[PDB]
Design a protein around this nucleic acid. Sequence first.
RNA 1: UAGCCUUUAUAAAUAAUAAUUAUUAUAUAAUAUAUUAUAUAAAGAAUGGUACAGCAAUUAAUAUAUAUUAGGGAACUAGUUUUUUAAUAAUAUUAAAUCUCGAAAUAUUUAAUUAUAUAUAAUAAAGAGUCAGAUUAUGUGCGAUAAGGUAAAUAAUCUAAAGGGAAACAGCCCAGAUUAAGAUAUAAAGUUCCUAAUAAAUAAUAAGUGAAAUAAAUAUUAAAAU
RNA 2: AAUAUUUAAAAUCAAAUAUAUAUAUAUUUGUUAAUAGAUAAUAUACGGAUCUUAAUAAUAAGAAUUAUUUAAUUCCUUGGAAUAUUAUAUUUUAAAAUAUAAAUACUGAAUAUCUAAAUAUUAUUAUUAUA
RNA 3: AUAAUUGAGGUCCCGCAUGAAUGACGUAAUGAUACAACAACUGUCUCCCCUUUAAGCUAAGUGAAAUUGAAAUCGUAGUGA
RNA 4: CAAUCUCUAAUUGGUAGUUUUGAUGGUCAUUAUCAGCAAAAGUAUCUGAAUAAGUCCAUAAAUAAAUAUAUAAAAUU
RNA 5: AUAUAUUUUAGUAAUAGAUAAAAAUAUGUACAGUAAAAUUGUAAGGAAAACAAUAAUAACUUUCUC
RNA 6: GAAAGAAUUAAAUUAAUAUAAUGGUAUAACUGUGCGAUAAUUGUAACACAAACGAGUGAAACAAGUACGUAAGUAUGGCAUAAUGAACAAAUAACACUGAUUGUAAAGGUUAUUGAUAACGAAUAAAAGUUACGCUAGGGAAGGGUAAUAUAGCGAAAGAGUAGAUAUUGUAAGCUAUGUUUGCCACCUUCGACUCAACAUUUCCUCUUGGUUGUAAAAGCUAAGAAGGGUUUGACUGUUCGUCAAUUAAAAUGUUACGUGAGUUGGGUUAAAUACGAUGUGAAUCAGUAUGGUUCCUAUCUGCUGAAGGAAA
RNA 7: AAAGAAUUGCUAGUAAUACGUAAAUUAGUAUGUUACGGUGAAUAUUCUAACUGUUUCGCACUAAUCACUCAUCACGCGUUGAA
RNA 8: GGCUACGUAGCUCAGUUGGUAGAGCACAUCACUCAUAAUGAUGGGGUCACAGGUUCGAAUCCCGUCGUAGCCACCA
Lengths: 195, 113
Amino acid sequence: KHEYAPRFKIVQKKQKGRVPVRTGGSIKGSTLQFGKYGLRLKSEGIRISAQQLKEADNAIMRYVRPLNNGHLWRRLCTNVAVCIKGNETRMGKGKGGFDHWMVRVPTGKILFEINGDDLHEKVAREAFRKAGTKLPGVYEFVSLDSLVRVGLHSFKNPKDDPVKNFYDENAKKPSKKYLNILKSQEPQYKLFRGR
Amino acid sequence: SRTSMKDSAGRRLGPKKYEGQDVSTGEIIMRQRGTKFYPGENVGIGKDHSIFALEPGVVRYYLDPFHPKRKFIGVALRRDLKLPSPHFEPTVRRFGRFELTNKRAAYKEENSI
RNA sequence: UAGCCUUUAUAAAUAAUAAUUAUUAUAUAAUAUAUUAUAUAAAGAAUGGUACAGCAAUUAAUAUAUAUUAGGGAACUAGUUUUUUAAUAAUAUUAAAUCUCGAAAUAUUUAAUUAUAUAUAAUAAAGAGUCAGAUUAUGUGCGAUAAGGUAAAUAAUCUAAAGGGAAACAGCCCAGAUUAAGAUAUAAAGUUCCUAAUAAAUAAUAAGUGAAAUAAAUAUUAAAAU
RNA sequence: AAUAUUUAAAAUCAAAUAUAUAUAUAUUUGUUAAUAGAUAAUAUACGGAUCUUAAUAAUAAGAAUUAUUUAAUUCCUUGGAAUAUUAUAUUUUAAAAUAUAAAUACUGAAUAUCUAAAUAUUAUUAUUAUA
RNA sequence: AUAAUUGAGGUCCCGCAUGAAUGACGUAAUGAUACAACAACUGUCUCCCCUUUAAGCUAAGUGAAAUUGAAAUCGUAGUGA
RNA sequence: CAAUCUCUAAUUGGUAGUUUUGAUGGUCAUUAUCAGCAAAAGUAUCUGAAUAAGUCCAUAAAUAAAUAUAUAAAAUU
RNA sequence: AUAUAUUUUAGUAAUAGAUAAAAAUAUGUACAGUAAAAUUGUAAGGAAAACAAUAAUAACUUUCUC
RNA sequence: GAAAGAAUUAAAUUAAUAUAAUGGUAUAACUGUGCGAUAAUUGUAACACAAACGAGUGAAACAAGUACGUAAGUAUGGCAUAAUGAACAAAUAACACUGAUUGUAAAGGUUAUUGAUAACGAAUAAAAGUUACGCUAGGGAAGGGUAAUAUAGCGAAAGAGUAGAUAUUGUAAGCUAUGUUUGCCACCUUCGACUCAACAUUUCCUCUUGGUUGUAAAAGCUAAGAAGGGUUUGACUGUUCGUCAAUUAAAAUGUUACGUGAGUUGGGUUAAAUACGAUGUGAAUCAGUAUGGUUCCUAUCUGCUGAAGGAAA
RNA sequence: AAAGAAUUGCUAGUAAUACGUAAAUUAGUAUGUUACGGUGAAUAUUCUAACUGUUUCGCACUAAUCACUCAUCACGCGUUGAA
RNA sequence: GGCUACGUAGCUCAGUUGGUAGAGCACAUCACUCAUAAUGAUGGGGUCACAGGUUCGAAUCCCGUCGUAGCCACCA
Ligand SMILES: [Mg+2]
Ligand SMILES: [Mg+2]
Ligand SMILES: [Mg+2]
Ligand SMILES: [Mg+2]
Ligand SMILES: [Mg+2]
Ligand SMILES: [Mg+2]
Ligand SMILES: [Mg+2]
Ligand SMILES: [Mg+2]
Ligand SMILES: [Mg+2]
Ligand SMILES: [Mg+2]
Ligand SMILES: [Mg+2]
Ligand SMILES: [Mg+2]
Ligand SMILES: [Mg+2]
Ligand SMILES: [Mg+2]
Ligand SMILES: [Mg+2]
Ligand SMILES: [Mg+2]
Ligand SMILES: [Mg+2]
Ligand SMILES: [Mg+2]
Ligand SMILES: [Mg+2]
Ligand SMILES: [Mg+2]
Ligand SMILES: [Mg+2]
Ligand SMILES: [Mg+2]
Ligand SMILES: [Mg+2]
Ligand SMILES: [Mg+2]
Ligand SMILES: [Mg+2]
Ligand SMILES: [Mg+2]
Ligand SMILES: [Mg+2]
Ligand SMILES: [Mg+2]
Ligand SMILES: [Mg+2]
Ligand SMILES: [Mg+2]
Ligand SMILES: [Mg+2]
Ligand SMILES: [Mg+2]
Ligand SMILES: [Mg+2]
Ligand SMILES: [Mg+2]
Ligand SMILES: [Mg+2]
Ligand SMILES: [Mg+2]
Ligand SMILES: [Mg+2]
Ligand SMILES: [Mg+2]
Ligand SMILES: [Mg+2]
Ligand SMILES: [Mg+2]
Ligand SMILES: [Mg+2]
Ligand SMILES: [Mg+2]
Ligand SMILES: [Mg+2]
Ligand SMILES: [Mg+2]
Ligand SMILES: [Mg+2]
Ligand SMILES: [Mg+2]
Ligand SMILES: [Mg+2]
Ligand SMILES: [Mg+2]
Ligand SMILES: [Mg+2]
Ligand SMILES: [Mg+2]
Ligand SMILES: [Mg+2]
Ligand SMILES: [Mg+2]
Ligand SMILES: [Mg+2]
Ligand SMILES: [Mg+2]
Ligand SMILES: [Mg+2]
Ligand SMILES: [Mg+2]
Ligand SMILES: [Mg+2]
């Protein structure tokens, strides 16, 4: 509903920033969560405007609405407010006025997701290709068995990466603050703190 | 047009004296906005929460179990002392005065009340 | 005026610059469950909150044949069910210059030790010039993730630096001309000829692709792996 | 053969290094190409010539492009050893045997060394005449 | 009006932003004023040709000038304050 | 009266000497807070600010609270 | 029971607690305590007036008691 | 087993803080309450932080006095970071320091206090415009870069096309090229006509060819090759352009310092004169209108057009 | 708390009357209607509005002054000038 | 920083040299009239500008501030 037009109470101008190249191997929003088939970015990290996303959504919908129990999950919201000065105006003299909403999209991230009752995968693939024709990146069809993109030419299965209880790890190799707290909890300090 | 071209300068609010550093009485160990560091052993605190040394010694940053979730800056009277000092041991104190070996000076001091 | 430069000196002078030690844990050995030594591992005294990472709280976004709160319809005889409309909850998933609960490296930075003394800091007495900067790389603000653009941050060079390379070249890659000499090591860059110097190996290309200034979505044809 | 993906060393396998060690653990490395798309005004414009090799047939050429490498090739631990190569000499019948060598690729600065000369400072001398 | 007119004259009045001695309006005459039309005329032009004289050119005599870092002073492309 | 001299006042582009900031098409110039600012400190531009500041707050809630009531004392009665 | 005199009371006014998030003295010092939101209710009361309620007692001290 | 106390643990700084925002604050810096109303006091302040100077900030300690607290102790205003202004000249007090011959005085000094210079390190007590009649010293304290726009192309194809997205058409969004427009940057300080044109091809005509239920024919439409040859004359306007008239096989689009002023012109743009409308108190002014109106050059080199001499043939 | 501009009735058995009485309409209700007596006054014509009959003069009115009637302006359709 | 003199009703304005709550004015209702107004009469609201004293007695004097502006001072 509000993914292409956030309702920040205090509307305000924003700096340009940069699209996060996720050097640490994030895989956040790079996985199929809601649907069966999806459309992910394949190229370098890119900014997608609100209008472009809306058009991609519309393109996908043409295939989704005919389906029985058809659904489209829009995974990303255009949260960054972009202002622009005109091409007509000189440089300097303040910042330009609000123009459009935009989203910073890392390399591996999923944009859309679909799942119908009577949806064959070929149709879904076609729809997602047609959606990709309207967006500024280069995109890729992603199924539930197809594995998570991280880099431009690199891949990963989330099933593989290890599970860890971090409290236990902390206890094993404790910080100074934690040790101080533990000492405080002990009786030779707790009795004589005198509050 | 109307531009937002106005800002105060930076308040120089780092630590002004570091761990293991020799100090003198009066010297500022920390400038800060509110007690990020609390005044520890042999150390005072000012109006602007500025930690300053009460005695000559060695600046030490530490945690104390009595005050968990609070960082401290104190001044150890020597380099030998671990400045979160043992609680039930006697306080390491500095006399900090000198006897008036000079006779006249001693006499003057005796006279003065 | 300070910053940076110069001259002449001063010491109960190393205070300077660089690194190490400093911590945590493990194993072994020796003393009294602790201490010391040895070895190994760990981005390893103190200060920090950027990258990264994250969705906690704040601010924002999405979904539920899930629950509650009311509303609009609807079927039988005000009660009731369903298809729901919003809010709230629950569960799952997401991001931000002014969010950071996790969190680097570089950094700031302390003592002693070692190494730099044909070397540094500090102080004293005196002379300046300069206050139009430029480019390259990285991280940003503005611009349109435009400018040989603009604004500052860090480093280098040019400025004021000749020499070799980059065809030619202020700012790039090497390297700092006291005067020669030209045997030996070479730097960056090169070795068919122009032009100082070359021979090999294994693959791929057939397009003169390309051969020191890489042009995109997409299409076609192959090639591998499943 | 056919259909449909992916173009990957994360997983997986293979290979190598480091800790107890014929194994385990940890780390490091290995996963497409071509063409089209293609484009303006003095004149082709990799700096220019020119560069993709070919048996018969050469004491002889066969990228001068792209990618990964080496300094003849293969094992052992920069070094030695073996292997064939190449060149040469000797002996025997243009070939065979023996042995010697080459294997340090090279060019390259006003860099460094060497080789000499000058000035300045530091530290030692020698000669001649605040010695 | 012209084959055809952003010009000219006539007329209309959302006069962006006329107006009465910073005078208002309509005429006769005048004007090397400005714009437009008709007639006549023509080398203005279609489209230039021929001719004449003074230069230009050559020989003799006299004899400038601005300019000038030094010049042994080509094209193209590239580079580059 | 008026004229002249001396003093005093009004008026003056008549006339003379001067000036017309730095930044911009009325707005910005001093101070504070955050971001920009890249985990010390500092850090700019006609950069972004739901930006904020030229202050505000005081002489006041008092007095009374142990020898007391008739009579007699004054070792506390 | 009633008359006069002399007194006494009635000026009727909130805090009764070291008060603790209604409003009021904004700098000192001493002593002490904890807010808010949301939720469930309740006369007018309704989304929005007020009041109530809404985390855990292991160990310790004293008291009574099987 | 029960009651009471002491409390501890968890959570919380989301409330509250005189006031912005940030940091801090429950050990509370927040809140209540007693006393008080004092420390919102007086002389010396080292040493630090910050820092060009001027200033700014924290502050141990010594001495005098005060308030609260049993005491320990705490208080030199406010949880902190804004809340501001130099000298000079005046003014008011206190100080007992100087007292221009001596004594008084005046006047100056010391100490405390007063009002502003916001262009906020403040030039004076006190200062606005105009010039196209201008003058001097200097500085530059279309080309180049860019490609948002513009022009052209490509991919994908919603949708028109009597039916069929792709004969022809092709929304909004996607990927490029160009340097032809309007911009931006600031390294770098004249429009049109005439004359002669050279080059490009993204081709308007002519030649060849593919597609065209939308090629029967003929006219077309669209696309590929193709730059050999050709591609206008008039009315209006300074105009390029545009409107129209009459033609043409066609009347293509650019580049060349938007080719060409040491080749011509000078209508536009343009200074001095003048008027009009508007603006201004005015001098004068204008992304206004109108009439008038100033540059010249014998060619040294390059280059090109022709013509000779010398030369090695 | 005897009532503003204004406005109603009444010259005699009338008005006035905090003087009463009756009937018609009803099953029933009079502050109304129609009738009866009782007691009983005050005032008085010259000026002006109106409205009836009289008259003078006037009259462009005759559905008779709510009469008739004049011009611009506005709406349509002709005609003829100027240019 | 000091010194003035003014601020009645919804509108305009009296009143002022003390023993007052008064005018027309525009506004809503009836009134004579083919109908409508002009004209006649219904009534309307003032803390006599916030707010204190002296005379049993002040809207008027002595004023504590509010509003909007003058004036002086200071103007270094
Ligand atoms: Mg991130
Ligand atoms: Mg700041
Ligand atoms: Mg200087
Ligand atoms: Mg040292
Ligand atoms: Mg940041
Ligand atoms: Mg943290
Ligand atoms: Mg500068
Ligand atoms: Mg630049
Ligand atoms: Mg220079
Ligand atoms: Mg150089
Ligand atoms: Mg240098
Ligand atoms: Mg040198
Ligand atoms: Mg090529
Ligand atoms: Mg190239
Ligand atoms: Mg691996
Ligand atoms: Mg070319
Ligand atoms: Mg080359
Ligand atoms: Mg050398
Ligand atoms: Mg016309
Ligand atoms: Mg004409
Ligand atoms: Mg007149
Ligand atoms: Mg006049
Ligand atoms: Mg005239
Ligand atoms: Mg004349
Ligand atoms: Mg001659
Ligand atoms: Mg050069
Ligand atoms: Mg003048
Ligand atoms: Mg920060
Ligand atoms: Mg910062
Ligand atoms: Mg910092
Ligand atoms: Mg930093
Ligand atoms: Mg806060
Ligand atoms: Mg410092
Ligand atoms: Mg200073
Ligand atoms: Mg306080
Ligand atoms: Mg406060
Ligand atoms: Mg002055
Ligand atoms: Mg005297
Ligand atoms: Mg100034
Ligand atoms: Mg200034
Ligand atoms: Mg000044
Ligand atoms: Mg001035
Ligand atoms: Mg003029
Ligand atoms: Mg269709
Ligand atoms: Mg489009
Ligand atoms: Mg250009
Ligand atoms: Mg072509
Ligand atoms: Mg045909
Ligand atoms: Mg031909
Ligand atoms: Mg031109
Ligand atoms: Mg020319
Ligand atoms: Mg020229
Ligand atoms: Mg003339
Ligand atoms: Mg009665
Ligand atoms: Mg009846
Ligand atoms: Mg009667
Ligand atoms: Mg009669």
